[PDB]
Amino acid sequence: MNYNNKILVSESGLSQKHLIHGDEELFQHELKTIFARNWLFLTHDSLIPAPGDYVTAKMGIDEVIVSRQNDGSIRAFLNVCRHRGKTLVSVEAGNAKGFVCSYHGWGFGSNGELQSVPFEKDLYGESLNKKCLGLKEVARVESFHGFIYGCFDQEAPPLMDYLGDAAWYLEPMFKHSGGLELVGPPGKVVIKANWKAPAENFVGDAYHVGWTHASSLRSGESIFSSLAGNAALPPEGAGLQMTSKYGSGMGVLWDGYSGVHSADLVPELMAFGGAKQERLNKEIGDVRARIYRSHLNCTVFPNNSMLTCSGVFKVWNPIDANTTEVWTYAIVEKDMPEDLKRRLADSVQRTFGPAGFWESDDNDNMETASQNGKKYQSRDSDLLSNLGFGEDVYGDAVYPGVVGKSAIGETSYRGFYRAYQAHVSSSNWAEFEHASSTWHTELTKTT
Amino acid sequence: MNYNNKILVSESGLSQKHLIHGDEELFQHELKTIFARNWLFLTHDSLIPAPGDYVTAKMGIDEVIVSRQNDGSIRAFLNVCRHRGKTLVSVEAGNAKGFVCSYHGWGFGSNGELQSVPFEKDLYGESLNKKCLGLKEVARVESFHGFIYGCFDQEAPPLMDYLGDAAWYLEPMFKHSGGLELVGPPGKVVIKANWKAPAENFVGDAYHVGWTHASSLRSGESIFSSLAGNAALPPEGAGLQMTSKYGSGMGVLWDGYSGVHSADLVPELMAFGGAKQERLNKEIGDVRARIYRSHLNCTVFPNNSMLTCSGVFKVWNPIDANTTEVWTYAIVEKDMPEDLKRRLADSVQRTFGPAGFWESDDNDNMETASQNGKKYQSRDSDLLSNLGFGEDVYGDAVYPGVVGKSAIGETSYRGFYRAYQAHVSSSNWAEFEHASSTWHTELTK
Amino acid sequence: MNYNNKILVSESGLSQKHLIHGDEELFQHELKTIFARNWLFLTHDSLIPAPGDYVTAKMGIDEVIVSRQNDGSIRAFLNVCRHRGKTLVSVEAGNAKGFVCSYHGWGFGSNGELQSVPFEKDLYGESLNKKCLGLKEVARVESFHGFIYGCFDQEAPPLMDYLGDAAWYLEPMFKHSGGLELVGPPGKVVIKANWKAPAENFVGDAYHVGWTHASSLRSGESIFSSLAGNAALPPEGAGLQMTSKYGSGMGVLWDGYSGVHSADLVPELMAFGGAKQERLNKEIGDVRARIYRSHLNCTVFPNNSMLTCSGVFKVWNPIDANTTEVWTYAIVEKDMPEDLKRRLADSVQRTFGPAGFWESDDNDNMETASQNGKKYQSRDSDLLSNLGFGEDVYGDAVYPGVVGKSAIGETSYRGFYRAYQAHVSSSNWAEFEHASSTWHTELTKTT
Amino acid sequence: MINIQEDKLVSAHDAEEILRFFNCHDSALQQEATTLLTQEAHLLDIQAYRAWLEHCVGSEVQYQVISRELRAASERRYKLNEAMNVYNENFQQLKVRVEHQLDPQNWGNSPKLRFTRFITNVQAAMDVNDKELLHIRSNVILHRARRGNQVDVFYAAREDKWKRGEGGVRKLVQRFVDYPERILQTHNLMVFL
Amino acid sequence: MINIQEDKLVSAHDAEEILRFFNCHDSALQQEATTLLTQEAHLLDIQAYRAWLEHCVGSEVQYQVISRELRAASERRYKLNEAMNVYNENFQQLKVRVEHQLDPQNWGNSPKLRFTRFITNVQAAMDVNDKELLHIRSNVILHRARRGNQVDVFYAAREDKWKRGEGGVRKLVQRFVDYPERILQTHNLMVFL
Amino acid sequence: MINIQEDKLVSAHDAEEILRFFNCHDSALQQEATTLLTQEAHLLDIQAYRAWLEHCVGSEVQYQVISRELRAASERRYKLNEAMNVYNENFQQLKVRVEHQLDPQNWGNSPKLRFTRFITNVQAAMDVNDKELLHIRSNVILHRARRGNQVDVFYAAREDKWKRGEGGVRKLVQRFVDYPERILQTHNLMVFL
Ligand code: FES
Ligand code: FES
Ligand code: FES
Ligand SMILES: [Fe+3]
Ligand SMILES: [Fe+3]
Ligand SMILES: [Fe+3]
C-alpha cells in the first residue's frame, strides 16, 4: 500500500476505510508513524513517588523501564540489554538503584548507565567503552499534572502543545481539583480488537451508550439509567463534543459527576463534586468549574482514554491489527477521603475492569468491527463518521477547539482520524505540521 | 509472485505446484480471483422456507445474511453494519423482518434497507440519506432445484451455464427424483488443510478409497466393502469420470445407491432407489435413470462438494492457506419416508460428520499434503494428476463433458485445476472466457 | 530487505542486528541460503545400524527419511509422496524395506524408488514412468565417525572440509577415543526462541555460565561449582576458544571431563577419562590426548550443538523466527561400561533435557533475546560480540583455526556470524567462497 | 427448585435435570457412580474398546452427542431442526466404530494415540419409576495427543442412565451430551466422551 | 507444618491455609463440601443465577477475585497497592451482576453462552471459633464457549467460607481467588468462579 | 479382564494395571488415597517443595517421567531404546531439584510462578505381597502461569506406589508417568507431576 497516496481517511474525517482495523501491513506502518512519533502514556507520580521506584510500561509494542531518579526527575529506557538483547526487567513495578541482566550479569543504573560488567578488567581490559553502552533512552518524557507520557521522537511538540485545545477541558479536573492520583495495579486483559476501536469509542462515542449499555444502565441505576434501550434522548444542551489539532478530543456530559457508578456511590460522589465545584467557581469561573464536575469521555491521541468523574483510565496497547492488551486503572482526586477512594477504585474495576459489566458489553462491538476489516468484501468499505458534520465551529468565545454543541455526534472521530491520516501519510513531524496547517478549517468546512 | 506469468498448474491440468496448498499470498489472491468471482453455496429452500427466515453463511471469508423475502425471493447481504462495521447478526439461523445493530441501534430490514436510526430527526435531521445506506448486497443469487448459490460478481455466467456439463449428471437426483431437501444444522469442524485438498478429493478421487478407507470399508460392510485394503479393483465398466468448463466435475460409480452407509441401511436404500429408478426409466430413459441411482462424488467449483446417494453435502470454507472450516449437511430425497430421512441423516454424520469414521480417515491426508506445501523443498514440487490422461473424450453421444470412461482416474482433477489456473491468471470473467476458449481440447489433447 | 546489500553482521563479526532473531522474511531467506545450502545433522550409525533401519529427521523445516540400505550405505529422502504430496512416514524410527503412502497406496522402496502403484496395469497401463518418480533425494549424505549429516546442495564442500579447523578439536573424542554412540530417543521440546539463540550460546558462550547457571552450579556440586554467582573466575590458562571458515567453533575447558555432571558421577568419569588419556598420549601426543578429556562446547554450523565430556548433543530445528524445536540426545564413548552409559544418558537429560535444570535456566535468555528482535525500537540495535577482539590469532603452531587463548570470550560468535553473513548475502557456494577468501584475516584484523 | 420464568437463561430440560439431583444425594450411590465412571474412563483411556463395550455398555444403549445450531435468545418463530447428531448410536453402531479403531489398516492409529480422561462433578440419583435405573451426571475433560505435536482437548457435561443387567453389573444404557463448542477446533470429534 | 524460612517460595498466607486442612480431614465434612460445590457449579453452569443467589450465597457474602501485580521475588521496599479487585462484591453488587446477565437487552448473551465447570481437590475444615462456619478450598477449571469458535478456559484455586443460615442451609459467605494469570487471555473475566 | 489378543490396541502393561484396580475398590482405601493426593497437590501448588520432600516422598523413591519414541503400530523388528527419561530421580536427585527451585539466584522464579493442580480419577489397591504398599493411580492437569502471559498446561496419568514409613505416614515410593505428548509445547517439563 502506498501510504503517501492512499486515502485511508476522507476529507474532513467523514469516513475511513474499514481495512484500517485489520491490515497487518498498516499496523507495522503505524509502529513507525503513530507509535514511534507520538506521546504515549507511561505512568503517574503516584506509582513511582520515591527515588528508585520504577514500573515497566509499553510504548507501542516496545517495553520500557520508567524510573524515578535521585534528583526527582523521571527517565525511561528500553527494557533491553545492550549486550545480547535479553529483556532486562521481568516484573511490573519495584524499587531498585540498578538492573542486572540475568544472562551475562551486566549491571545498569537506574539512570540507564552501564555501571558494571562481570570481570571487566580480566575480560575486556580497557576495551569496553561503558559510556556508549547505556540503555537506549526514550528521548522525551513529560508530565501533565503528574500523568507521565513518553515519546521516542525528539522533534515532537511539547506535551502541553500536543494536548492542544483538549488541555483546557481536562485542567479543571487534572489541575484545579488539587490533582488526581492513579490507582494501581491496572487490570490487564487481551481483546481481539484493533487498538483504534476502543480509542475511537472513548474519544467521541456517546451515541452507543443507551443501546450497547442498555442492560448495564438498567441493572445499575446510575445517573444515565433513563437512557437504557434508547427509551429517552439526552435533553437539548446535555453536553458537547470537541477535538483538537493533534487528534485528542472528548465528549462532555454536563453535571454527570457520578458517571457510570451504580446507585450505591451516587449520593456521596455528587455531594463531593458539588462542594468542590462551589469552591472552584471563584478560582476559575462558572464554566470551568462546571466542566470540572461534568463527565468527560476522552482519548489522548493515539491510545490513552479516560472517563473523568467515573475515574476510568485506559491504555489500549497494540499487539497486532486484531489484538490489543487493555490496561485499566482508576483515577481519583487526591483530597477525597481514603475510604471513598477505595470504593471508587473498586467501582471502576466493577464497571470497566477485566470483569467490568459495562466494558464487557463493548467486546463484540470492538472485536467484530476490527475483524471485519480483514474480510475481503469489507476492506474497501467506508466506516462513517459524519454525524453532526456541517455544524462544528472553531474559535468560539467560550469553548476552544473544533466544537460540536450537542452531546451526541462524531466531531471527535473526525478530528481523531484527520490527525491519524496526517501522521500515516507523513514521514516526520514537519510534514504532519504541513499537512495540518488547515486542520480546523477542514473540520468545520461546510459550516 | 506474478499470477499473470506464474505457471501454477501445467498444460492440460497434468500437475500443480505444491505451494498452491500452502502460500498465504496466493490465498489472498484466491479471495479476489476465486471467491469474489465464482458461485458459492449459500443454503437451501428447506432451511429458509418462510418469509423472514434467514441463515448466515460464509462466502470465502466474508459472512452474509441470506433472507427469504415477502415476495418469496431470496436476497443475501454482507453481515456488516453500514455505520461503523460491527457484525450485524451473531446467530446461524432464525426468523425476523429486520436486524438491529447492537452497537448504535441502526435497524435494517430483511430486504437490506436502512429503515431506522435511533433519534434520526434530532441527531441527523434531514442529512442522512438512508436510501444509500442499505446493507452491501450479494449481486447474484440463483437456485438449482432448491440449492441456493450466491456470487459477488455481476458478470458471472448464470448458475446453470456455470454448472455446464456437470448439470446433466446431477439432474436425475436433484430434479427428476422429485427434488432433494438439505437437512440442517450442519456439523462444523476446523481442519488444518487448504480448502483445495478436500475439494480435489471429492471432485475426482475414487483412487484413494480402498486404501485410505480400508478400515471403514471393512468395519461397516457397506456396498464397497470388498475394496478394503486394495483387495479388489472395481470391475471393467464400474464407473466414469467427467469435468466441465468452469471447473465442476465428478466421478460416477454405477448402481451404488446405498453409497457409504453401513449394512443396517443398505437394503432399504437399495429397495427405495431401485423402485424410483424403475419409474424414471420411462421419464428420462435408462441411462439417466441409472445415473440417478449411481453414486456421484462431485465438487461444484470452487468449494462445495457432495456424495449423491450417500447424501453427504459439504462446504469447504477457507480460513487461511492451511485452515478450513468444514460444514457437513445431509441431502435426502423429499419423498422418502420421514423415518428413513432421519436415519439417513444420522448416517451421513456417522460416516462423514464431525465424528465421521470415514471423514476422519482423510484428515492426515488433507492436512499433511496442505502443510507440506509450505516446506521449502516442496514448494516447487509437482503434484501429479495425470492418471487416465490421453484417454478422455469430449462430445460423446451419451455422456457430455470431458469424460473418462473408467471409475478410477484424474480427469476431474485436471478440469478443476485448469479452471483454477484460468481464474488465478485472469482479472475478470471476460479474461477467464478468453483463457477457456479451448478448454476441452486442452484437456483431451 | 535486500540481502546482498543488507548488512546484518558488522565487519569481523563484532556485532549483529537484533532483527536477525525476529524477522520472518529473513527466516524465509535463511531457508534458502542457510538450510538448503549447509550440512545438517541427521542421525548416527547407532540409531540405524541394520539394513532397513530408518529414522525421520528435520533438515531446516523439511522432514526427511534417513534409511540404511542393504549395501550398508545410507540414503535420505524427502518425507513426501511423489503423487499428491502426503507425508509418507509418520513415526520417528523403525525398520522397513519400503514405505507405502496411505493416501492412494503408492509403495516406495527404502532406496527411494517407486516400486509399486495399486492397479498400475489396469489404470496407468504403460504410461507411468516409475523411474522418474522416486522420492526426492538428499543429494549429499556423509559421516563423521558415525555422525551422519545431510546437505541438499550438491556443490557443498565435503563434510570434513566444512568442519575445517574445528575437526582437529573434535577428533580426540570422536575418533581417537574409539568412537561415540548416540543414545536415543531424543527429548523434544519447543521453545519460543530463534534457532540462532541456542546455537550462539553453545558455540562460544562460557561467559554466561556462572551467572545464568548460578543455582544449577550451587545445587549439584559439579566441577564448576565454585563459579556459582560469579564468586570466582576460571584461572589464567583455564581454556581457549576457536572458530573456523565455515562457521563451526567451540570453547575448550581444560581437563573438565565430568562436565556438568553432579557429584554422584564425577569420580567414575574422571577415572575413566584419565585412564583413556594416559593411553592416548602415546597415539596422538599430550596436547591432543588432553583435548580428548577437556570439555568442548561446540556448534557445528548452522544448528547442531554439543558438549563433549558432558555428553550433550542438540539439534535446534527451526520452525519460524521465534519458534525452535529442540532435540536432545546423549553421546557416550562406545567402550564405557553399559551401566555407566545408562547413568550418563539419564544425567544428560537431567541437566539438559526437557526437564533439564541447567537448560531451563537458559529459556528466558533465549526466548526474550529472540522476541525483542521483533520489537520496533530494537530491530536496528546491535547485539555485541567484541569480547577478546584484537587478541585472536591464526596459524598458531599448536592450535589451528582462529584461536582466542582464554576460556571466556566471543571469538566463536564472531566466526559463526561471519560465516552466517557470507551465506545470507551469497547465492551459492562459489559466492560464499569468494566472500570468505580472507576469513581469518578479517577475524584477526587488529591482532 | 428452578423457576424458569424468573431464571430466564435456564432451559426446561436443564431445570428438570437439576431437580433430580438436588434432592437425593445418597453416599452409597455417589461412591458406586464414581467407581463406575472412573473404571469406564480407565478402560477407554488405554483403548480397551472391546472390554468397554463388554463391561460398561448395555445392549439397549443410545449413545448420543449433539451439536445445536446457534439461535437468537429471543427466537420464537424459526423451528426447523435444532441439532444434528455427532453420535446417535446403538450397540451395533458402537461395534462398527470399535472394529474401525482396532483394524490394523486404520492408518490414523499409527503411532498409537494417547488418551487421558478427567472425570469430575459426579452426581447420582435413582429413577423414580425404574428402580434398576441410575441417573448419573458427570463432566469430562478429554485430552487426545498424537503424532508429536497434535493436541486436542474436549470438554463436556454427560447425562447418563446406567442399568443393572445380568451379573448385577451396572451398564451404560443412555449417554447424552450437548457438545458446548458449536465449531469444533479439535480436527474431529472421534473420541468416546 | 510449613517452615517458611526454609520453604522460601511459600507465602505466609499459603502456609496458614494449609495448616487448617492438613489436620482435620473429616469424612462427613468432605462429602458435605463436595455436594455443596457440585450443586453450586451445576446451578451456575445452567445459568440459574437467581437460584444460585437464593440457595448458595449468603447475604453477608464477600465475593472477591484479585489480580496481583508481578513483583521481584526479592522485593522489600516498594509497597504500593499490590493487587486490584477483579470482583469485590457484596450481595447487592452480585444482584446487579445477575440482573445484567438476565436482561433481554444483554446483547452478548445471544446466542446463549455455554458453561461447563470442573471442580476438584475439595478440602473442608470447620473454623475453630465459629462452629457454624466451614472453610472449603477447591480448584476450578471453567470452560466458556460462545458464538461458534470463541472458547475461554479459566483456572483457579478458591478459598471459601460457607455458613449455616436459616433452614440449616450452608451458604457461601466468602469466596477469595488470587487469579493465577496476570494478563487475561479470555477476553474478559465475566464468569462466576 | 483384558484379552490383549482381541483388544489389539492395549499394551500388556496397561492390561496389568487395570487388573489391579478393577477388582478391589475398597472405600477406606479410596478416601485415604484421595486425601494423600489432594494434600500432596496442595503442597506442590503453594511451592512448599521442602515440606513435600519431608512429608510425601519416601527415601527409597523412584520419581520417573518418560517420553516414548513414536513407532509404527505394526513394528516388530526395531528394538533400540524406546523411551528416554525426562525424570528418573532418587531422593537425593529430588533434593538437588528442590534446592535449585528455592535458590534466590534462580532467575526464572522471579516474579513468583503460579501453579494450580487438578487431581482426578483416583484409584487405590493394596499390593498382594507387600501389605504396607498401596498402589494409587490418578490423573493430573497441571496449570503453570508466569510473567504475564505465559501459560502451560500439562496432562498425565500417574502410576504411584505409596508406602507406610515411620510414624505410620504413607509416603511416595514410586511415581511413573508416560508423558502423553511426544513433543512438549510448554517450553519445558520443569514441574513436578
Ligand atoms: S544479554 Fe545482558 S549481559 Fe549479556
Ligand atoms: S456500527 Fe452498527 S449502528 Fe453503529
Ligand atoms: S498422495 Fe501418496 S499415493 Fe497419492
Ligand atoms: Fe461502551
Ligand atoms: Fe476419503
Ligand atoms: Fe547456559
- The 3-class SS string of C208-244 reads CHHHHCHHHHHHHCCCCHHHHHHCCCCCCCCEEEEEC
Q: Enumerate residues 6+ apart whose C-beta is below 8 A from E13.
A: none
Instruction: Give Cα separations from E99 to A191, C202, C244, E50, E96 (angstroms).
Output: 25, 60, 72, 9, 5
Between CA C251 and CA C387 the distance in angstroms is 14
Give yes or no: residues B144 and B80 share one domain.
Answer: yes
Instruction: State whether D180 and E39 contact (CB < 8 Å).
Output: no
Q: Which of B423, B424, B405, B404 is nearest to B413 (CA)?
A: B404
* Cα separation of the two ends of chain D: 29
Give yes or no: residues C292 and C381 share one domain.
Answer: yes
Catalytic status, residue A364? no
Cell of E87: 470482583
Q: Which of F147, B411, B144, F159 is nearest to E183 (CA)?
A: F147
Domain limits, chain E:
1-193
Assign residue A155 the CATH number of its domain: 2.102.10.10
Fold of the domain spanning F1-193: Nuclear Transport Factor 2; Chain: A, (3.10.450)
Give yes or no: residues B336 and B392 share one domain.
Answer: yes
Instruction: Give Cα separations from E127 to E133, E161, F164 (angstroms).
Output: 6, 9, 30
Instruction: State whether D120 and E119 contact (CB < 8 Å).
Output: yes
How distant is the Cα of F186 from the closest Cα of chain C, in angstroms? 7
Between CA B223 and CA B216 the distance in angstroms is 12
Burial class (CB in 10 A: 0-12, 13-18, 19+), A163: buried
**Catalytic option among A205, A255, A361, A392:** A205
| DSSP reduced 3-state for B159 | helix
Q: List phi, psi (to 5°) of F58.
A: -80, 155
Give yes or no: residues B100 and B23 share one domain.
Answer: no
Question: What 8-state DSSP symbol labels residue B20?
Answer: G
Between CA E174 and CA E63 the distance in angstroms is 6
Question: What 8-state DSSP symbol labels residue A234?
Answer: P
Residue for cell digits 426447523?
D80
Residue for cell digits 478530528?
A415
Pairs of CB atoms within 8 A across E/F = 94
How distant is the Cα of E36 from the closest Cα of chain D, in angstroms? 10
Between CA C262 and CA C189 the distance in angstroms is 23
Residue for cell digits 470497566?
A352
Q: Enumerate residues 6+ apart whose C-beta is below 8 A from D189.
A: B189, B354, B355, D65, D86, D87, D154, D179
Q: Which of B86, B87, B88, B82 is nearest to B129 (CA)?
A: B82
State whether the Cα torsion A304-A305-A306-A312 is positive or negative.
negative
Residues pairing with B420 in the sheet:
none
Instruction: State whether D100 and B228 contact (CB < 8 Å).
Output: no
Instruction: State whether E111 and B188 contact (CB < 8 Å).
Output: no
According to DSSP H, which parts of C132-186 are helical? 159-163, 166-171
Does residue B83 line the site of ligand 2, with CB under 6 A? yes
Q: Are there at least 3 beta-carbon pairs closer than 8 Å between D and F?
A: yes
According to DSSP H, which parts of A133-265 are helical? 159-163, 166-171, 196-204, 209-212, 214-220
From F109, which residue of chain E is nearest by alpha-carbon distance? E73
- Could you tell me how many helices (H) and strands (E) chain E has, helices first? 4, 6
Burial class (CB in 10 A: 0-12, 13-18, 19+), A278: exposed
DSSP characters over A235-266:
PTTSEEEEE-TTS-EEEEETT-TTTT--TTTH
Burial class (CB in 10 A: 0-12, 13-18, 19+), A333: buried
Instruction: State whether A354 and E188 contact (CB < 8 Å).
Output: yes
* Mutation for C interface: B362, B376, B381, B411, most C CBs within 10 A: B376
Q: Please give the single-letter amino acid code of residue B405.
A: K
If you compute the radius of gyration of chain E from its CA atoms, what whole number of angstroms results? 18
Q: Are there at least 3 beta-carbon pairs closer than 8 Å between E and C?
A: no
| DSSP reduced 3-state for A437 | coil
Give yes or no: residues A265 and A353 share one domain.
Answer: yes
Between CA E110 and CA C124 the distance in angstroms is 56
Between CA B245 and CA B438 the distance in angstroms is 9
Cβ pair A263, A311 in contact under 8 A: no
Cβ pair B238, B223 in contact under 8 A: no
Does residue B118 line the site of ligand 2, with CB under 6 A? no
Residue C423 annotated as part of some ligand binding site: no
CB-based contacts of D73-78 (< 8 A; 24+ apart in sequence):
D73/E104, D73/E109, D73/E110, D73/E111, D73/E112, D74/E104, D74/E110, D75/B91, D75/B94, D75/B95, D77/B52, D77/B94, D77/B95, D78/B53, D78/B93, D78/B94, D78/B95
Burial class (CB in 10 A: 0-12, 13-18, 19+), A339: exposed
Give yes or no: residues C335 and C444 share one domain.
Answer: yes
Partners of chain A (3+ Cβ pairs below 8 A): B, C, E, F
Cell of E132: 457454624
Cβ pair F164, F132 in contact under 8 A: yes
CA B54, B59, B61, B66: dihedral to nearest 10 degrees? -10
Between CA A136 and CA A82 the distance in angstroms is 8
Q: Which of C379, C383, C372 is nearest to C16 (CA)?
A: C383
Give yes or no: residues A338 and A239 share one domain.
Answer: yes
Strand order in the sheet with B62-68: B74-78, B62-68, B53-59, B93-95
Cβ pair A204, A416 in contact under 8 A: yes
Instruction: State whether D118 and F118 contact (CB < 8 Å).
Output: yes
Q: Which of B435, B440, B383 is nearest to B410 (CA)?
A: B383
Between CA A284 and CA C339 the distance in angstroms is 87
Ligand nearest to the CA of A102: 1
From E24, which residue of chain F is nearest by alpha-carbon distance? F35
Residue of B21, B211, B364 with shortest CB distance to C105: B211
How distant is the Cα of D152 from the closest Cα of chain C, in angstroms? 17
DSSP H or E run through E91: helix E91-102
Experimental method: X-ray
Between CA C370 and CA C194 the distance in angstroms is 6
Beta strands of D13-168 (E only): which ranges?
57-68, 83-89, 114-126, 133-146, 150-164
Question: What 8-state DSSP symbol labels residue E96?
Answer: H
Chain length of chain E: 193
Cβ pair B410, B389 in contact under 8 A: yes
Between CA D19 and CA D128 the distance in angstroms is 12
Angle between helices C338-352 and C266-292 (to 10 degrees): 90
Does residue B218 line the site of ligand 2, with CB under 6 A? no
Residues pairing with A381 in the sheet:
none
Give the distance (Å) from ligand 3 centre to CA of residue B212: 10
Does residue B445 line the site of ligand 2, with CB under 6 A? no
Residue for cell digits 466544537?
A403
Between CA C344 and CA C363 the distance in angstroms is 23
Cβ pair C315, F183 in contact under 8 A: no
Between CA F172 and CA A81 the distance in angstroms is 44
Choosing from C136, C164, C192, the residue where a domain stops is C164
Residue B213 annotated as part of some ligand binding site: yes
Partners of chain E (3+ Cβ pairs below 8 A): A, B, D, F
**Domain containing A385: what range?**
1-35+165-447
Most informative mutation of C77, C80, C86 for ligand 3 (most atoms within 8 A of CB)? C86
Does residue C432 line the site of ligand 3, with CB under 6 A? no
Instruction: Give Cα separations from A85 to A81, C367, C379 (angstroms).
Output: 5, 10, 10
Per the rule left: phi > 0, alpha: psi between -120 and 50, beta: everything else, C255 is: left
Q: Which atom of ligand 3 is nearest to the CA of B207?
A: 4
Q: What share of chain A is helix, strand, coil (3-state, %, to 5)?
A: 35, 25, 40
Catalytic status, residue B339? no
Beta-carbon count within 10 A of D74 CB: 10
Give the distance (Å) from ligand 4 centre to CA of residue A371: 18
Q: Enumerate residues 6+ apart whose C-beta is below 8 A from E129.
A: none
Instruction: State whether C90 and D147 contact (CB < 8 Å).
Output: yes
Between CA F123 and CA F3 the distance in angstroms is 21
Choosing from A164, A185, A206, the residue where a domain stops is A164
Residue A151 annotated as part of some ligand binding site: no
Cβ pair C342, C326 in contact under 8 A: no
Q: Enumerate residues 6+ apart whose C-beta is below 8 A from B177.
A: B276, B280, B292, B333, B335
Give yes or no: residues C172 and C160 share one domain.
Answer: no
Residues pairing with E68 in the sheet:
E83
Q: Does the beta carbon of C207 lie under 8 angstroms from any beta carbon of chain A?
A: yes
What's the farthest any 2 CA atoms get from each other in chain C?
A: 78
Give yes or no: residues A23 and A6 share one domain.
Answer: yes
How distant is the Cα of F191 from the closest Cα of chain C, in angstroms? 8
Beta-carbon count within 10 A of A87 CB: 23
Between CA C17 and CA C23 the distance in angstroms is 10
Residue nearest to atom 3 of ligand 2 (CA): B104
Angle between helices F91-102 and C357-372 (to 10 degrees): 40
Most informative mutation of A89, A100, A106, A123 for ligand 1 (most atoms within 8 A of CB)? A106
CB-based contacts of B136-140 (< 8 A; 24+ apart in sequence):
B136/A377, B136/A378, B136/A381, B136/B77, B136/B78, B136/B80, B136/B82, B137/B75, B137/B76, B137/B77, B137/B78, B137/B112, B138/B59, B138/B64, B138/B75, B138/B76, B138/B77, B138/B78, B140/B39
**Catalytic option among A23, A165, A361, A362:** A362
Between CA B314 and CA B333 the distance in angstroms is 17
Chain length of chain F: 193
Between CA A440 and CA A443 the distance in angstroms is 5
Q: Enumerate residues 6+ apart whose C-beta is below 8 A from A78.
A: A62, A63, A64, A65, A135, A136, A137, A138, C377, C378
Most informative mutation of A77, A82, A86 for ligand 1 (most atoms within 8 A of CB)? A86
CA A116, A117, A120, A125: dihedral to nearest 10 degrees? -90
Does residue B81 line the site of ligand 2, with CB under 6 A? yes
Between CA D15 and CA D2 the distance in angstroms is 6
Per the rule left: phi > 0, alpha: psi between -120 and 50, beta: everything else, A90 is: alpha
Q: Are there at least 3 beta-carbon pairs closer than 8 Å between B and F?
A: no
Between CA E147 and CA F29 the distance in angstroms is 45
Q: Which of B122, B82, B121, B124 is nearest to B103 (CA)?
A: B82
Question: Which residues 361-380 of A are in CB contact (within 8 Å) with B?
Answer: 364-365, 368-369, 371-378
Between CA A306 and CA A326 the distance in angstroms is 13
State whether the Cα torsion B80-B82-B86-B89 is positive or negative.
negative
Cβ pair D120, E117 in contact under 8 A: no
Does residue C334 line the site of ligand 3, with CB under 6 A? no
Give yes or no: residues B277 and B137 share one domain.
Answer: no
Burial class (CB in 10 A: 0-12, 13-18, 19+), B95: buried
Between CA E154 and CA E189 the distance in angstroms is 8
Q: Which atom of ligand 1 is nearest to the CA of A84?
A: 1
Which residues of chain C are within 8 Å of residue D110 when distances are taken between CB atoms? 90-91
Q: Which of B57, B58, B59 is nearest to B67 (CA)?
A: B57
Beta-carbon count within 10 A of F139 CB: 24
Which residues of chain E are within 8 Å of residue A185 when distances are taken between CB atoms? 67-69, 81-84
Total domains in chain A come to 2
Task: Please list, residue by residue across B278-313, b when 16 or more beta carbons sit within 10 angstroms of its beta carbon and e when fewer do.
Answer: eebeeebeeebbbbbbbbbbbbbbbbbbbbbbbbbb
Cβ pair B419, B398 in contact under 8 A: no
DSSP characters over A16-27:
EEGGGGT-HHHH
Which residues of chain E are within 8 Å of residue A220 when distances are taken between CB atoms? 96, 100
Catalytic status, residue A104? yes
**Catalytic option among A208, A264, A320, A382:** A208
Between CA A220 and CA A222 the distance in angstroms is 6
Assign residue B410 the CATH number of its domain: 3.90.380.10
Residue for cell digits 457484525?
B87
Cβ pair C153, C139 in contact under 8 A: yes
Q: Which of C357, C447, C432 is nearest to C394 (CA)?
A: C447
Between CA F91 and CA F97 the distance in angstroms is 10
Question: What 8-state DSSP symbol labels residue A85?
Answer: -
Give yes or no: residues A155 and A234 share one domain.
Answer: no
Cβ pair D170, D29 in contact under 8 A: no
Between CA C341 and CA C358 the distance in angstroms is 20
Give yes or no: residues C158 and C238 share one domain.
Answer: no
Between CA B78 and CA A23 the distance in angstroms is 19
Choosing from A110, A130, A164, the residue where a domain stops is A164
Residues pairing with A58 in the sheet:
A63
Residue nearest to atom 4 of ligand 3 (CA): C104
Cβ pair A198, A326 in contact under 8 A: yes
State whether the Cα torsion A204-A208-A212-A214 is positive or negative.
positive
